[PDB]
Every structure is written in C-alpha cells, then in structure tokens.
Amino acid sequence: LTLGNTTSSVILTNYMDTQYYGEIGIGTPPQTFKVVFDTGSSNVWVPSSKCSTACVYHKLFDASDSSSYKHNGTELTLRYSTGTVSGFLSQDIITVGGITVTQMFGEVTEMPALPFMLAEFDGVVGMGFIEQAIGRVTPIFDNIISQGVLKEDVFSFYYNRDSQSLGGQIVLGGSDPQHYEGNFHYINLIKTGVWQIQMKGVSVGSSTLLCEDGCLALVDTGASYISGSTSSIEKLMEALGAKKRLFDYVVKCNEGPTLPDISFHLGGKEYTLTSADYVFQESYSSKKLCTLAIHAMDIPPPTGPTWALGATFIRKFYTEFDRRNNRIGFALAR
Ligand SMILES: O[C@@H](CC1c2ccccc2Sc2ccccc21)CN1CCCC1
Numbered sequence: 001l002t003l004g005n006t007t008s009s010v011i012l013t014n015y016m017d018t019q020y021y022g023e024i025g026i027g028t029p030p031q032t033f034k035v036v037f038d039t040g041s042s043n044v045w046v047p048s049s050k051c052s053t054a055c056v057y058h059k060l061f062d063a064s065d066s067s068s069y070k071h072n073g074t075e076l077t078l079r080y081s082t083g084t085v086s087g088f089l090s091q092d093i094i095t096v097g098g099i100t101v102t103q104m105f106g107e108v109t110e111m112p113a114l115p116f117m118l119a120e121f122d123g124v125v126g127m128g129f130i131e132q133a134i135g136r137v138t139p140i141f142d143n144i145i146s147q148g149v150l151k152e153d154v155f156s157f158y159y160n161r162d163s164q165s166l167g168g169q170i171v172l173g174g175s176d177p178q179h180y181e182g183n184f185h186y187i188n189l190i191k192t193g194v195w196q197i198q199m200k201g202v203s204v205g206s207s208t209l210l211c212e213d214g215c216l217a218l219v220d221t222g223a224s225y226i227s228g229s230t231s232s233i234e235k236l237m238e239a240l241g242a243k244k245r246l247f248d249y250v251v252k253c254n255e256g257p258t259l260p261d262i263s264f265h266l267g268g269k270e271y272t273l274t275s276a277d278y279v280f281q282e283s284y285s286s287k288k289l290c291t292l293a294i295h296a297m298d299i300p301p302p303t304g305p306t307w308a309l310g311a312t313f314i315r316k317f318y319t320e321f322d323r324r325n326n327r328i329g330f331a332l333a334r
C-alpha cells in the first residue's frame with residue numbers, strides 16, 4: 001500500500017558556486033556516492049570498481065558487495081558538454097533521501113582525468129525525460145513516479161551562495177517554502193522530453209539586445225553557469241565590456257559592481273540578475289581580473305541551439321520541475 005503523501009529532501013553541498021552535490025546509496029548494504037542531480041540529462045551513473053584516470057579520486061561501486069545487484073552489462077557511452085564517460089549497465093536498489101527504487105544505472109569504467117579529476121562528485125543522477133535517456137533506460141524520477149509515493153509529481157531545487165550553512169536542497173514531491181519568497185510563476189515546456197522553455201528576450205540594463213525574435217532556454221541544474229551560443233555570448237560580453245581569457249570571460253574587479261543588470265524574459269516576466277549574481281567578486285582591485293558566471297556552450301541539435309540557465313540563474317530563482325503539468329516554476333530564492 002503506497003499512499004501519495006510523501007515529500008523527501010536531499011541536502012546538497014555547494015562546491016565554489018559551480019558544483020552542487022548530494023548523497024545517494026546504491027546496493028544492499030548501501031554504498032554511498034556524491035552525485036549531481038542534473039535536469040539536462042536522463043541517465044544515472046557512478047564510477048565502477050572495474051575502472052582501470054579520474055577513478056582514483058572517486059568512490060567506486062563494487063557489484064560483488066551487493067546482494068540486490070542484477071547483472072546486465074550492455075555497453076553505454078554518455079556525452080556531456082564537459083566530457084564523455086563510458087561503461088556498462090547494472091541494476092540495483094538506489095536510495096535517494098529515503099525513497100528506495102530499483103534502478104538501471106551506468107557502472108563507469110572509462111572516466112578521463114580531464115575534466116573528471118575536477119569533479120568533487122562521484123557520478124550523475126539525470127533528472128531529465130526518457131526521450132533523452134541513452135539506451136532508452138528508464139530515468140530515476142520516472143521510476144519514483146511509478147511507485148506512487150510522492151505528494152505531487154514534481155521536484156524542486158534550491159542552490160545557495162557559498163560557516164555552517166546549507167549548500168542547497170532537492171525536494172522530491174514538492175517545494176520547500178522556507179527557501180523561496182512569494183509565489184511561483186510557471187512556464188510551460190515547448191514539448192515534453194526536455195526541460196526547455198521559450199525565452200522572449202535577453203536585456204542588458206535598458207536595451208533588449210539578444211533573443212529579440214525569441215529563443216530557447218534549457219533549465220539545467222547540472223550547468224554551473226548561464227550559457228548561450230558562441231555568437232550570443234560574444235555580443236553579450238561586448239555589451240558588458242568583458243574580455244575573453246582562455247576558459248573564461250573577465251572584467252577588472254573594480255568595474256564588477258558597476259556592471260549592468262541582465263534580464264531574461266520568460267513567460268509573463270523578466271528574471272533579473274544584478275552584477276552581484278554573475279560576477280565572482282573575489283577582489284575589488286583595479287589591478288585584478290574578476291570572472292563572470294556566464295560562458296558560451298554550443299548545444300547541438302535536437303536540444304540546441306539553446307541558452308542554458310544553470311546554477312547562476314537557480315541561485316537567484318528557486319526552481320520547480322512539474323512532470324504532471326509539463327511546466328517549470330520560478331520563485332525568488334530565500
Ligand atoms: O572551478 C572553476 C572551473 C574548473 C573546471 C571544472 C570542470 C571542467 C573545466 C573546468 S576549467 C578549470 C580550469 C582550471 C581550474 C579549474 C577549472 C571555475 N571557477 C569560477 C568560480 C569557481 C572557480
């Protein structure tokens with residue numbers, strides 16, 4: 001007997017405003033892993049004990065220590081913006097904030113030192129739809145929905161700004177009103193299968209200089225930043241006075257607080273980020289260079305070309321992902 005009144009939460013760790021990770025347990029007895037909960041992907045994967053470069057710094061799943069494990073072994077390859085992992089399929093019981101689910105997941109045996117040596121998390125829990133799942137593997141949230149335990153078929157994200165403070169939180173089955181102010185404003189997904197909405201414009205202060213004839217916005221919990229196409233970012237950075245370095249865009253630290261507001265027109269409203277929301281203000285010196293929490297990412301079709309609203313956006317706006325209604329809700333984070 002499963003009664004739909006459950007609302008479970010996973011505490012997240014904030015690593016330098018770029019990586020937000022929580023704990024999941026795999027197997028019997030449970031083997032714990034630090035995972036990023038990512039709306040931009042649909043597969044679950046952790047490093048395998050069968051891993052032969054980045055594997056050395058992470059926790060590895062040993063199937064031989066789990067009584068609940070069921071072999072499969074189908075080969076699997078997962079491509080991310082940052083890097084590609086490879087392994088095989090395994091099935092086991094996954095515990096996520098109290099909820100226990102029988103899940104098919106990836107046992108990663110090929111984890112390159114770049115970029116995975118830089119990951120503070122062990123694996124990824126893809127919070128996207130089956131349409132985007134590799135090997136057509138049933139996503140974890142789809143499996144939790146099938147159990148009929150959740151209060152509502154929704155999950156929400158809270159990302160805090162980096163004492164003994166909470167780095168973030170995921171709520172499965174609801175939203176935590178302690179982490180948002182006012183009410184949610186919802187935007188319907190263009191289509192089911194992808195956590196993507198229509199964007200009606202991007203404004204720099206006064207003038208709406210980009211996305212004038214509309215564009216797409218992927219609401220990506222796994223993305224550290226706000227990203228646009230190379231073309232869109234080059235124009236945006238020019239309007240900000242930012243300069244291209246090797247991996248990032250920079251401004252003189254003293255100019256940082258003088259930077260204009262960036263607005264994203266989504267559904268009925270404008271979602272504004274002030275300079276304090278997008279500049280890593282590590283100094284105020286005129287002789288130092290400060291990094292922006294904005295970059296270029298060319299997302300390939302069918303999903304891209306698209307903007308991605310990552311942790312930079314989510315820190316400002318507490319986000320709710322509604323599977324029942326196929327919509328996303330935003331509320332000012334508290
Ligand atoms: O953490 C930083 C990003 C980090 C990184 C992680 C995964 C994949 C690529 C890169 S590029 C790179 C290069 C050299 C050192 C570290 C890094 C971002 N910074 C901005 C705020 C926190 C620091």
Ligand SMILES: O[C@@H](CC1c2ccccc2Sc2ccccc21)CN1CCCC1
Binds near residue numbers: 038118295
């Ligand atoms: O956004 C970050 C990407 C992040 C990540 C998140 C979800 C799923 C896969 C990966 S791959 C990976 C590997 C190592 C460290 C971090 C990460 C990387 N960014 C840092 C600066 C912008 C790029």
Ligand SMILES: *[C@@H]1O[C@H](CO)[C@@H](O)[C@H](O)[C@H]1NC(C)=O
Binds near residue numbers: 072073074089104
């Ligand atoms: C692995 O699992 C898939 C279902 O996701 C199934 O179709 C396939 O036959 C399985 N392979 C093996 C070798 O068990």
